[PDB]
Amino acid sequence: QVLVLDGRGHLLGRLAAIVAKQVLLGRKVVVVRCEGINISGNFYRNKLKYLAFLRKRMNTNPSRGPYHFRAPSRIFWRTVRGMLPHKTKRGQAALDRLKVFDGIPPPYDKKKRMVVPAALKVVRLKPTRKFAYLGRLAHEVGWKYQAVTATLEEKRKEKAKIHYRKKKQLMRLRKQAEKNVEKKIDRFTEVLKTHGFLV
């Protein structure tokens, strides 16, 4: 009953608008791997935009001024918050349902994560256009834990490779076992393929 989305290959605003709309409808949304987010335009454009945002601060007291979060997950969180009525109680309650993470944390490392084709770079962006990765942008503006995240993601990918190898073995054995006892399930298979299955 909770949406888990993989942030790799998704555009910032395109995914943020959809996530905010779903969150306002009472849906619980989890966004994972926020370093895979990419933004349209060359890297220098987005670097300059984030530096210009960094310049924004209260002259009399920067502590009370804007909070420039450097983590990619917090950057995505702020972009989503910009698309919500966060000043109202309803907006805050909706924003409480949102949850973002750098990398893929252990609570969600063993879950299937969905992707939104309406926010993917391969779909929404021309192949000849340039883009910038959110992880590299964050690392060059103050982020500290890019290498640790990369190492943990490599370990997680190795574990996922082991699990996927086991799944391949299980599926291959399942397919062979179906062939072994195909004579005892012929009547069950015929009715399945009569109504539009296994075809």
Partner: protein
């Protein structure tokens, strides 16, 4: 003047008969307009621009849509333009490839609006003529004059991005 899916209208008109001139001559024009009501207005505008004739002093003798003779054949159409820019006016010749003459004129209007920011009211259509494979000046039309023409669909960006919005599979662009 606006634009839609234009149709070709043949409009015939003359000045009102007078005792001085018992039998005034008849004039006809080719007008591409969304409907006959605006076709009559365009005919009167062009006739007043050319002849000493106005709507009050004249009448419309016949107004009728001109059907495409060969809608099922692909043809090359040459259109001679007369439009106004921010600066002075200019004369243009453009070529389009379409099944119908009205479709060619609509493509001309769309292309003029896209490339030169020219509205419909600033554009005057002078002559539209069908041309064979030869006598074509624009390489864009000419590159399709090939019996053994081959081209694939390299990057098929999928539609239905909002048909079921959350999916576990990433889409495919190679087909």
């Amino acid at each position: 003047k606006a634009s839609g899916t234009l149709r070709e209208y043949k409009v015939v008109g003359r000045c009102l008969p007078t005792p001085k001139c018992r039998t005034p001559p008849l004039y006809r024009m080719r007008i591409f307009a969304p409907n006959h009501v605006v076709a009559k207005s365009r005919f009167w505008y062009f006739v007043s621009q050319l002849k000493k004739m106005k709507k009050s002093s004249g009448e419309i003798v016949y107004c009728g849509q001109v059907f495409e003779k060969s809608p099922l054949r692909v043809k090359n159409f040459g259109i001679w333009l007369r439009y106004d820019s921010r600066s002075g006016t200019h004369n243009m010749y453009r070529e389009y490839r379409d099944l119908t003459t009205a479709g060619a004129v609509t493509q001309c209007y769309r292309d003029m609006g896209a490339r030169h920011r020219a509205r419909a009211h600033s554009i005057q259509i002078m002559k539209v003529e069908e041309i064979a494979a030869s006598k074509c000046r624009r390489p864009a039309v000419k590159q399709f004059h090939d019996s053994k023409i081959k081209f694939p669909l390299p990057h098929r960006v999928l539609r239905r991005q909002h048909k079921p919005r959350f999916t576990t599979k990433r889409p495919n662009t190679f087909f």
